[PDB]
DNA sequence: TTTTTTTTT
DNA sequence: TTTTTTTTT
DNA sequence: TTTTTTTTT
DNA sequence: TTTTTTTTT
DNA sequence: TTTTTTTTT
DNA sequence: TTTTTTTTT
DNA sequence: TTTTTTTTT
DNA sequence: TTTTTTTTT
DNA sequence: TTTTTTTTT
């Protein structure tokens, strides 16, 4: 059963939402288990239409990675990264759609700015969500993120009875 | 069941590949069950032949105790260590085999080399596989083998129903 | 009578124009008046075509709000803001256009770079102009704009005959 | 006869090539010569398309000028740039195609991050190839261009025999 | 041949061109060459009269010796120096042209003034030419002064085969 | 026609040579030349048997890079790097000779020393040749390799006349 | 054909001058060329006899190694260096004379001394000459000695064409 | 003898 | 047009 | 008893 | 395949 | 008397 | 043309 | 809907 | 394919 | 006139 319990920040003028897809395991003929297609965190976002209401038609996601979760559990308060991705990679086609993920300190150390770009070539579209994430939020995603790290990596099977 | 849930990093020379090894167990006559055998966080590395394209047949083990999990996890950014073993210890062929597996921080600080060392004085080999590790990347060790401590040293198994 | 006394910088590749827009007032019914439409600083950003020669028909507009002066005066030189505005918010066609006016300082300290970026999913365009301001240029700006501030707030109204 | 001498470095999502391209010279009637096209040093951006294989049909180029380059290889460890070219300036069709080339250092100072972007309002496109450069790829590049600098600016013409 | 590839800067009042001028060699009756007329880095300033346009005909030369360029390129960003050349030196009419040539780099480290005064006591006149160059800009000079001065010492001729 | 003049350095237990070996180059059909086969710094090793008398017999050779050269000319003081190699990479008999080269500063900061280790699993053989290098050496090394460094890149062909 | 482009600095008591003296190569049957004798940057010094005049029959000679250049050049601003000399080394007639040349930097880092000593214990003589070297003057020679070195050393016919 | 490979003209 | 001069081969 | 609300499957 | 060993229930 | 110029309504 | 909205007199 | 791929049992 | 332009000999 | 020497092709 699919279970439904995001971590959801909503803001001025977009929301965030986070919630771990687990990995995909193939039974092997051998009798044994291996993991197949990898887990992520899955983050999305959404505009503000009007006043606190949001457009969930306008949202996009972005699969944070088991590194790119090590990556962000381990920023500094001063610290930024940002993410390229590809949707269609390795595919038929790809490079027409690009998303970046971007996490920066702001000024004051009140948090961060997440925001999430999405450019398509295709559609000849160009969207940006960014939301502001106070150190208590962002708290809450580190401590929620390193907890559900091992499980979208599958270390979560290896377990004693 | 047996699981293969692999945190492997794919680098220039060679692969990196992490796993733990549960614990075994044996159940007393008293009824009670007693840790027998000790788990392990296993260690991977083989060789690129050609272009990304790597060689298993050639791949070398080193397998992480409870003490030195708990020494990696614990380094700081600028802190290395160096742990040494006799695959063949305290066994009618020790010596023989001697593997070293050193983390040391790179100049920029943008993560740590990992490199394996076997020295084998029966076949007369000299084989080190040597792996960069990303911040990020070694973050997810960190937690991953955090999270895995517990469960080789059997503590998963102290458990309120 | 409407009034024409922009401070403008030109440079490069764009030229900068600001000017305050004052509040609009509705007169009460009890005879008292109340501030209706709000007051901003509006700049004005447009191309140079050829040498020393602009095109104004290429000109893009952006509000500033009063919080956003209060924030544009109160800059340390090693500080740095972006903000982010949609023309037609809370209106029938949002989030097609996208404007952000981003101040950060250059390198030397010798002033900052004020660029203006507009994103059209409508007309399907990305323009940029971005100007170079000295720090007696930016001098200016903040005298004149804190000048200007409680005039576009309407504050100005408040005398003693 | 053209010459074919690319530094170039090839890395995840795409390659960057750098060459110079000489002055060209016009022989006076008085005798002598004079400098008419000035030299650069041609950055060349690519797309990864499959694994370590390149679109070289995606390429985009960038024109580096002999101050940018002065400006490029005086950078300390620390310090970043950012370039603004229109490909189409003082012609007739200017405003519609618009380069940026920035050179950021990446936290861990193993480095920096070269990316190119490309907005083309004719064709309705926006592309962006980043490339990282490790310290001492950066350290070719700036003796290689320190080497070049004369060279496109047409000074090695000055010589004794 | 002569050779015209000045590094040239124009900007608001005026303009600086630099380019070197070879030293001239006597061909001893012994066989060899001996150095006669010591090479230099010519600058050039002349004045921008209306917009973006300037008076050649106004223009002021100076001469870098050997030791002044050696003096210029070993500069910190911090340092100033301040040159003192008299055109008629040791000839029947010194004393009258006075020319001083002075780098000071401004307030924000965004480079240097580069200005050359010019007091001539025969046409009673009073001449100042300043240039603003970027730290960009200098490092050009520097880098390309410093290719020139072994050619103007006449050191180019020391060369195996 | 070959050339041989070798910086080399001689010294207690090995003696150290260093000489550029050019590019090739193939010369296109269309009549434009093309870089071919890439230029190193050529680095020989060789023992000392006896009192000041070496065995050129036992020399072993290690080809540095362009990037390893821009590694090597861009060390601090304190500095230290690493570089591995398979003569026989991506060939029928790779990983049986693995070649290592350190340069790390020695306590005092009276320079480096310069190693080479070379491990051959088929002939079952471990060499190491260690050679102290000054502060006053290793600066003609740094001097003479930034020197070669575009001409290995074969940028010395790109020349005005 | 010979050259004469000396470096020269006069001043109070004596004069300096420096100038390059190229390898000698022998060709080898071979058909390849091998450096013979190897460069040098020669140093003469002399005295000042009456008011700003030089006894050229009293001038001392100094000949410059790859080393010694390499040791120069990379001197700090508060280092200091000496070299002590031989004429007639390894020959009948040694420990006779003896140079020592000596770069001090002066009380207030304006430059440095070079003093040669030289004593003569077949002649029975005793001699030194001194000369101030400002900032300026000494990055001529470091400059110039750099541009010197490769040639010194023969890397000047590594050459592609 | 030499760490290779990726993309053109 | 250009700050010169000092000492050789 | 408990600060709520915003958007899905 | 894996550095082991020490002491219980 | 005053350093000017660039683009509108 | 312009990021809006919230509460009075 | 989701950046992929590399190597086993 | 490439950001241009300004001033000579 | 010049600090030399070490090992090849």
Same mark, same amino acid.
């Given at each position: !059963?699919?279970?439904?319990?995001? =971590?959801?920040?909503?803001?001025?003028?977009?929301?965030?939402?986070?919630?771990?897809?687990?990995?995909?395991?193939?039974?092997?003929?051998?009798?044994?288990?291996?993991?197949?297609?990898?887990?992520?965190?899955?983050?999305? $976002?959404?505009?503000? *239409? !009007?006043?606190?209401? =949001?457009?969930?038609?306008?949202?996009?996601?972005?699969?944070?990675?088991?590194?790119?979760?090590?990556?962000?559990?381990?920023?500094?308060?001063? /610290?930024?990264?940002? $993410?390229?991705? /590809?949707?269609?990679?390795?595919?038929?086609?790809?490079?027409?759609?690009?998303?970046?993920?971007?996490?920066?300190?702001?000024?004051? !150390?009140? !948090? =961060?700015?997440?925001?999430?770009?999405?450019?398509?070539?295709?559609?000849?579209?160009?969207?940006?969500?960014? *939301?502001?994430?106070?150190?208590?939020?962002?708290?809450?995603?580190?401590?929620?993120?390193?907890?559900?790290?091992?499980?979208?990596?599958?270390?979560?099977?290896?377990?004693?009875?």
């Amino acid at each position: !059963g699919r279970v439904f319990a995001p =971590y959801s920040v909503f803001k001025g003028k977009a929301a965030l939402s986070a919630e771990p897809r687990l990995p995909t395991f193939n039974r092997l003929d051998s009798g044994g288990v291996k993991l197949n297609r990898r887990g992520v965190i899955m983050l999305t $976002f959404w505009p503000s *239409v !009007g006043e606190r209401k =949001y457009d969930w038609e306008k949202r996009q996601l972005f699969a944070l990675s088991a590194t790119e979760v090590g990556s962000l559990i381990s920023m500094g308060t001063r /610290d930024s990264s940002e $993410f390229f991705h /590809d949707p269609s990679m390795l595919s038929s086609n790809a490079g027409q759609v690009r998303k970046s993920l971007s996490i920066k300190p702001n000024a004051d !150390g009140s !948090g =961060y700015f997440i925001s999430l770009s999405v450019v398509n070539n295709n559609l000849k579209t160009n969207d940006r969500f960014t *939301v502001p994430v106070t150190t208590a939020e962002f708290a809450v995603m580190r401590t929620a993120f390193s907890f559900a790290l091992p499980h979208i990596m599958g270390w979560d099977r290896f377990t004693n009875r």
